[PDB]
Each structure stands twice: as C-alpha cells, then as structure tokens.
Amino acid sequence: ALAQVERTAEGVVLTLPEGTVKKLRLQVMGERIIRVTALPGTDFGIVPESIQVVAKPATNVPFSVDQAGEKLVLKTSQVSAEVSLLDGTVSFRDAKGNVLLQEENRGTFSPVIHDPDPVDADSYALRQEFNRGSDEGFFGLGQHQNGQVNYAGENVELTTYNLVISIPFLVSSRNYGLLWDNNSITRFGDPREAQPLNQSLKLYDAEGKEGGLTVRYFVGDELKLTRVEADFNHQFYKQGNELENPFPEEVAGAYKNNTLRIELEGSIEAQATGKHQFKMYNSGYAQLSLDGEVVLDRWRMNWNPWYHNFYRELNAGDKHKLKVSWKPDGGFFHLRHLDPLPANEQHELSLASETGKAIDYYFVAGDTKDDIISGYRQLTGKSVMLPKWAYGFWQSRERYKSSDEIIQNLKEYRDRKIPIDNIVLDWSYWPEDAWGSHDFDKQFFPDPKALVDKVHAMNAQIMISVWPKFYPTTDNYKELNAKGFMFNRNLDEKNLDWIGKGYLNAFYDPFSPEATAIFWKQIRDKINVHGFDAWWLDAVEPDIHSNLTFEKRKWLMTPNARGNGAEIFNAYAVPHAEGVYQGELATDGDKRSFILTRSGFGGIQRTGSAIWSGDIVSRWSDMKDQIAAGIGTNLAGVTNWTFDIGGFTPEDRFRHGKKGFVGSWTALDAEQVDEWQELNTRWYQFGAFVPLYRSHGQNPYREIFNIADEGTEVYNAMVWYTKLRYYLMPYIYTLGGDTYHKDGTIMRGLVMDFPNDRKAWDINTQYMFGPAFLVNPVYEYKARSRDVYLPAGSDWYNFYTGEKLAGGQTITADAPLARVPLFVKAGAIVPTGPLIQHVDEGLNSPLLITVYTGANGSFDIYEDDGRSLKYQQGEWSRIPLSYDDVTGTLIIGDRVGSFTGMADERNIRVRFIAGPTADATNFDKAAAEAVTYTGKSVSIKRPR
Numbered sequence: 001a002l003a004q005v006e007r008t009a010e011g012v013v014l015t016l017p018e019g020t021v022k023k024l025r026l027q028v029m030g031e032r033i034i035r036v037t038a039l040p041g042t043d044f045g046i047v048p049e050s051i052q053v054v055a056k057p058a059t060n061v062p063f064s065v066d067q068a069g070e071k072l073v074l075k076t077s078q079v080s081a082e083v084s085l086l087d088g089t090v091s092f093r094d095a096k097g098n099v100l101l102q103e104e105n106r107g108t109f110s111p112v113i114h115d116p117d118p119v120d121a122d123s124y125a126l127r128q129e130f131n132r133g134s135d136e137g138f139f140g141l142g143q144h145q146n147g148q149v150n151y152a153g154e155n156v157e158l159t160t161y162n163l164v165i166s167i168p169f170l171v172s173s174r175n176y177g178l179l180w181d182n183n184s185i186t187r188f189g190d191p192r193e194a195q196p197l198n199q200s201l202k203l204y205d206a207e208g209k210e211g212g213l214t215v216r217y218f219v220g221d222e223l224k225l226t227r228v229e230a231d232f233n234h235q236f237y238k239q240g241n242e243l244e245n246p247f248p249e250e251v252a253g254a255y256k257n258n259t260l261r262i263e264l265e266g267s268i269e270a271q272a273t274g275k276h277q278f279k280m281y282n283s284g285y286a287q288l289s290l291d292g293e294v295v296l297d298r299w300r301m302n303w304n305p306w307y308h309n310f311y312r313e314l315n316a317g318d319k320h321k322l323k324v325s326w327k328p329d330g331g332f333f334h335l336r337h338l339d340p341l342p343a344n345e346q347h348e349l350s351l352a353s354e355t356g357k358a359i360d361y362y363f364v365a366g367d368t369k370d371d372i373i374s375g376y377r378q379l380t381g382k383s384v385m386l387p388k389w390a391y392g393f394w395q396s397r398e399r400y401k402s403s404d405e406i407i408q409n410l411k412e413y414r415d416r417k418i419p420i421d422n423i424v425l426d427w428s429y430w431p432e433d434a435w436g437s438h439d440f441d442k443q444f445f446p447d448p449k450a451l452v453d454k455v456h457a458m459n460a461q462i463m464i465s466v467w468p469k470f471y472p473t474t475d476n477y478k479e480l481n482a483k484g485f486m487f488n489r490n491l492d493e494k495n496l497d498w499i500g501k502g503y504l505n506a507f508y509d510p511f512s513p514e515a516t517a518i519f520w521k522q523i524r525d526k527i528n529v530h531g532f533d534a535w536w537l538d539a540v541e542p543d544i545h546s547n548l549t550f551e552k553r554k555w556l557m558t559p560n561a562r563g564n565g566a567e568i569f570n571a572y573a574v575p576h577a578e579g580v581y582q583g584e585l586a587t588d589g590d591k592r593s594f595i596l597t598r599s600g601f602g603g604i605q606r607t608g609s610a611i612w613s614g615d616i617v618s619r620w621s622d623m624k625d626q627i628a629a630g631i632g633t634n635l636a637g638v639t640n641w642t643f644d645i646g647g648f649t650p651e652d653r654f655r656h657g658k659k660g661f662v663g664s665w666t667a668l669d670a671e672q673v674d675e676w677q678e679l680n681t682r683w684y685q686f687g688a689f690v691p692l693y694r695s696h697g698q699n700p701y702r703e704i705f706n707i708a709d710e711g712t713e714v715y716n717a718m719v720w721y722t723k724l725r726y727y728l729m730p731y732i733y734t735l736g737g738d739t740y741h742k743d744g745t746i747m748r749g750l751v752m753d754f755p756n757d758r759k760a761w762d763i764n765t766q767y768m769f770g771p772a773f774l775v776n777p778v779y780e781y782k783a784r785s786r787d788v789y790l791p792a793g794s795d796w797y798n799f800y801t802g803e804k805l806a807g808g809q810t811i812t813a814d815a816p817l818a819r820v821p822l823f824v825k826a827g828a829i830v831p832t833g834p835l836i837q838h839v840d841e842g843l844n845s846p847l848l849i850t851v852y853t854g855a856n857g858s859f860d861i862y863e864d865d866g867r868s869l870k871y872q873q874g875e876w877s878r879i880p881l882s883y884d885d886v887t888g889t890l891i892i893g894d895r896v897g898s899f900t901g902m903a904d905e906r907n908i909r910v911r912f913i914a915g916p917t918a919d920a921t922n923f924d925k926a927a928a929e930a931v932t933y934t935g936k937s938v939s940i941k942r943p944r
C-alpha cells in the first residue's frame, strides 16, 4: 500500500499506512532549505513552537511536485527531495542529480528514559539515521572540549555545561548541512549515553581475578585501603557539597584536606571487536594508562571536571592492563565507556534526542560552507552587528574589587600605550546578602555612574556581570516569584552557594517573554541607568548548583514555561539573551547592545551575543582544545566566540606560593615564572586571532603588565600582538561587518576554504582567520617550532618575513617564543590602519593596502560608525579592492554607500608582497604607492 499525499502551500504531507510514523511533512523554507518532520501521530500541532528557528515557510519560492510510481519528487531551483511512497524516507539531491543526504529509515521512536520528571504520553526518545557507508566529513555541532573537528565516525554528546555549548547545526564535507531542531540533550554518532566501565567490559583486578578493578587509597604516600570495585564512582554531589558516593572513613578526611590520592589497577576485556570509546571524567590530577602507555594526562580545578576521551580498537577476548592515578584535590571522577555500535550503524550519520514529539530537522543545501552557514542564519536569525569596540582588546578579572581598581587598571594600559577598548566588572559588586538586587555595595562601588563616566572619559567601554540568580530575600526575587517565574526546587533542596556561610538561591525561568521582560526591567532600572555598555550574562546553562547529576539539573528546571527541564536542557541561553536584547532595543533604538554569555544554542547570534568556552584551565591541553572548540562553534553558524586567554583557573602552584597570594608575576615562586609567562605569551598570540580578543581569569592577575615586566621579550610579544590586532582592525571589522551583511564566519575550519583537500578536514590545530590568515597556535610548552600543514591549491607567505611557500605540504614552521606561525594565502588583500589605542581612534583612518601576489584577489573593506543601528538603514560603506595577478594591477573601486561621520577623502597607500622583505610587518614605514582616494575608482600597478 502506497502513502497518501496531500499537496500544501508549503510542500507535501504524506500519510503512511503502516509503521510508528503516521505522517511525513516537507516544508519549503527557502530556495535551499527544506524542513522534514516525521510525526508518530496525526496532529502536527503537537510540535512546540521552535526556539532556534524564527523563519516561516517561504511564500515566494517556486517549487514543483511530481509523483510517479513509488516515488514523489519535490524540488526547488536548488534542491530535489525524493520521497519513498513505500516508507516515507527522504533523499536529497542537488540541482545536478548528486545525492547529498539519504535517510536510512523512517526513524526510531522509543520511550523517554532520561527525564526525571513525568513524561507526556506523546513524548519519545528520537533517532534518525542517514548515509550509511559514507566517506564524508562532519563539522559544526558547536563548542566541544575533546579536540574534534571532523566528527565522522566518532561520538559527540550535545549537552550543555560550563565548558560545552550545543548548537545542533551539522555541516558536511558534501554540499549540505542540517539543523536538528530539538531542545533536549542530543547525541551525534552513538545514540547511547556513555556507560560505566563494567557494563560492556569484563574487568579483572590487579591479580587477574575477574570482578572489578583494584582500588588503592593513599593518604600522602601511605596506603590506607585496598579493595576491588566494579564501578569506581565519585562523579557528582547529590546535594550541597556531599558526594553521592562518599569515600571510606579511612580516607574521607584526606579527601577534604587534599592529601588523598588513589590508584586503579586491573585489566579490561572487550566482548565485541571494533572501535571502543573511553571517557575519563575528572577534576584534580588524573593520568590513565593502557597497555603500559599513558593515554590521558589531565588536570582541572576540583569544581569544574569534564570528560577526557580517546577511542581505541579492541578485539573481543583480549586483556589490556589499565592503570589510573588520581589525586582528587577535592574533585570528582568517573570512568566511562561505549562498545562498538552494531555493524551497519558504525559508518553512518546518526542523530538522537532524549525527548520530543517528532523528528524535526532542516536540510540546507550550499555550494560552499559559507552558503550552508547562510541557511543557518536564515533559519535562526541574522548575526546582528556587534559594536566595533567588541572586536578590540578586552581586559577582565575574577575579579576587580572596587571602582578604583577598575579605573587604575584601565589607566595603566593607557599610560603604557597598550591598546584596549573594554574592561569588565565580574560578579560580587552587590551587598553580600543581596545577590539579585542589582544594587552596588557602597563600600567598594560607591558611585556606579561615576565609575562608568571615568571609563568613558578614557575612551573605553565597561561590561558588567549579571546572573539569572536571585536570593529569596530580594525584592527582585519576590517580584519574579509572585508570577511563578522562579525555579524554587533549589531552595527545597537547600543548596547553599559558596559565599560566607552559604546562601539559599534560585534561578529564574526565562522560557516565557513575560519573565524575561521583568528580568530586563530590573537590570534596566538598577544598572542600565548608570550607562554600562554591555551585559556579561553568566551561568546561563543554567548552573544553578555545580556538580549535581545531570538528572538533578533537569529536575531543578521543572516545571518551566515549555515543560520539563529535560525538554529544553540546551536552550536556556537563547530566550534569556533575547529578553535583554529586546529590552535594549526598546530602550535605545539607535545604539548597538552587546552581550557576552556562557551558553548558547541555535539562534543565539540574533541577540547580539558572543559566547565563550567558560571556565577552562591554565593548561596546554586546554589551550590546544580551544582550537577545535572555536572551529566547531563557527562551523555551527555562531561566529562571535572567544575564551579566557591564559585559562580561567590556574593550578595552585601559580595561584600562591612562598609569598602568599599571587597578584603580579613577581609573587610567583621562582620556578613557576617561566611556564606562567610562556603559557600566557602563547595564549595571547592565539587570542589575538580569534573572533573576540579577551584576557580573563582567577589570580594571578592577567593584565599584560602583571604577567611580565616592561621591556622583557614576553611583555614585548604580548604588546606586539595587541598592537597588531589594532593594525588589522580594518581587516577584522570587515569580517565583523560580514558576519551580518554576508552571513560571514570569522574563525574558519580548513574545510571551509579548502573543501577539496581531504587532509585539511581533520586538522584541529590550525584555522583560517578571515580569508587571509592561516593561524597555527603553539600549544606545547618549550616548543620553538611546530608542524604546519599548508593547504593545497594555494601558495602561502610567511607573514613576518615574506617568504613564499607552495601549498600541499607540511613544514616545520619556526615558532620562537615571541611569535605564532602565521601564513598569508596568496591573492590575499589585507588592509591595515595606523596604530590606535581603541577602535574609534581608527574611524576614517589612512589605509595601507597590502597585496600578497601570485593569484587574483578580492576584498571589500566594510566601514560604518561602529556604534549605532543606522547600518540597518543602509548607513555603511564598502571600498572594493580587486587584484589581477596577470596584469599586476590593484583596483580600488568606486565606494559603495556612505554613513554619518564618513570621510569623503581617504589617504590610501598600496604595496605588493611577492617574496622576502624586511618590511613585511613594518606597516608605517613600508614602501608603498600613495593615493588620495575620494570614492572614485583608481588603479595601482605593481612595481615592475
């Protein structure tokens, strides 16, 4: 029996005769975008209004429907959707008959198993499988902490955490991507949550006896207890600061005073042959060895543990020695594992969500990755312009403790002529017992408006922290609570926070606009009136109480406006930021707002928000990981992204020592100076080349002049990259402009610009920063060089020396401490400006246009006032640059557009780099041909 077909204004709806899926709907969303919804019922009305997707079915996109035999074809000018009338499965082809994406079945619905709260009768766990046996690459999915760039053949858990941001937009190496529109925890690859080690492995203790691993408890170096445990688990608190599983009385005290250390020893045995995944969740110091070799070596501060993963091929029956050393230092630990999927499911695309009413996704065709990202922006909203200053240098601290401290640090930068735009006030400016009141403690912040006025008189901006957190004693808590907008379970649980004796606290429910409107009005009345420029919306996972099980985290958010916590687990940040963004629009409809927030989801970019990777650690491995973290965030369609340069929490050896608390580097124990300075030097280098450039963290102090003394190599190196950031502002703000006007992506995985170079896909230590710069951060202590793969199909220039190199090879790039290896793509046209201390000083600046010869080029410099919403009414300009390598001619074309404050006349000089030159980065002094530009096209010829 064949499925019945109904033609609609938006596409078609099939009614399937047999199977769990009763109806399959296709909706045309754009020339390149088709929505697929598989429904285990007859009423599409049960699918909740999307949080990610703001787009509606198109009304101006022609499409055709042809039905013949057992196939129905729906197509637009760019996409063909072929649907089986036998089983309702969909296959997508491009305009030229190429198969991009093929459903392997009609999808799997099954009972919700990860929702601690009562589950609706029409809610299910969902899974959809595509493209079995495909060799494609997969990218995006957001910000993850396991170094993955090409996810193909691996697992990714799309959850929400301090360190992890899920954006369920998937990009293929093929000419498509897809938005999976589900708000609950989602899994790419294996649909199963990782298991305890003994669920699908045989365990043997240190003596070979089956049953569990040998566990040794040491106090200092004295062994206190040995025993065999099937599942060593100290992963979460059940409540307050009490573990679900306490330590034995022999060592419980040692846990509390950090003298405890533990060893696990035994053997593991696969029951099935194939690729197994292992995940070591921990804070404190952990090292794991397999077959006598160290596989993982990690540290995180106790209160912010995470999973550290590896995959390994195992044969059924084989025994492998496992050794773990773990010094908890008050932290957490659990070892997890997944055995191979069934044969046919191992090489395929699989997406699964914990709870939903239907399988609901959007197929997005695109000839380039930029095109695919554009489909994401069309579905979930434009990346609205940040203020230009958001792209300048940010200085932050956990935490500045008074107005004077803020002013003094900003002034110190200005006094040292180190460029800076923004400074940040972290938590705790309010009276101690009044978190949520948004009042300023008179003792430390006596006059918040005077504070803002001084920052502004120094031509800088100030951002201030605001959490979703309220103490029940505050008027603000009470106003929100009276309308049912507070998640009060955390009060019932009596989970006290870390301040003083500890305070009862709750987080509000941002899932209805009525709630977010109140939240906004409160900060409008208390904080916005003082002139603060930006909102640091922290802890928006939400992190109501750290280190509870994820089930408890779900439960704490029940009930909410959209249902259970499990149903919207990944989506908190969007409605929250949106309330603030909409509030700002209603307040001043001509000033760009700015939000920095610690979580995200599809659509976050429509709220004028950047996101950051949260409380990472001052560790090389973390620094390395931030590369994949940013690449995946950008490939998921969210480009304004950043991190704490230097990491958030350093190890104790950095935080104090023989002289007590370490503020300035001068207080470090002598033997810690070198690494502290080197790590920060490398991390500043890296940070200068991510979308937002921001120093932040717990002590030591992170200002450049607190990391090292003036005149030193490291001080000079940090200053040089900060200055370079500003020299590049014409280039960088062009990228900033493109994020909005061209659905642009700033921090680019190599697959974006080298889609046909299969070797480039997997790389997780390099990326393109805009169209010109191949960035290659140094992530190893003491390294003075590193391998750099130069993508094929282009030649490359050493940015610092002018040396030209052929593409399609790996080199050992020179990487002295003072420099990060940087290469420029031939044909690049890079505009720089003069040295400036903050962005507005650079408005209408003289320009140096540097052409990197050897191929044609094209770059249109975007400029506008940098602050207002006028760009939305067309107030902006582009100065088009195009280079023809055959004739050696750079054309500065007719200026497009204009804006209030724009200079009609510009001094522009042009130079060409074709090889080694001593002036490669001497912008001010380089020989260049000068032109007086007045908006009309001029041509500059390369010198013979």
Ligand SMILES: C[C@H](O)COCC(COC[C@@H](C)O)(COC[C@@H](C)O)COC[C@@H](C)O
Binding pocket: 303, 398, 427, 498, 543, 546
């Ligand atoms: C000790 C255990 O409760 C962890 O405290 C971590 C903590 C980090 O502060 C970060 C700042 C608010 O941005 C408080 O918890 C923050 C989590 C919940 O995001 C700092 O605790 C400092 C000691 C000295 O009290």
Ligand SMILES: [Cl-]
Binding pocket: none
């Ligand atoms: Cl001066």
Ligand SMILES: [Cl-]
Binding pocket: 459
């Ligand atoms: Cl000034």
Ligand SMILES: [Cl-]
Binding pocket: 458, 459, 837
């Ligand atoms: Cl100034």
Ligand SMILES: [Cl-]
Binding pocket: 456, 531
């Ligand atoms: Cl003002």
Ligand SMILES: [Cl-]
Binding pocket: 836, 837, 838, 841
């Ligand atoms: Cl100045």
Ligand SMILES: [Cl-]
Binding pocket: 841
């Ligand atoms: Cl100035």
Ligand SMILES: [Cl-]
Binding pocket: none
């Ligand atoms: Cl000035």
Ligand code: NI
Binding pocket: 452, 453, 456, 531
């Ligand atoms: Ni002002």
Ligand code: NI
Binding pocket: 652, 656
């Ligand atoms: Ni100590």
Ligand code: NI
Binding pocket: 459, 837, 838, 841
């Ligand atoms: Ni100035």
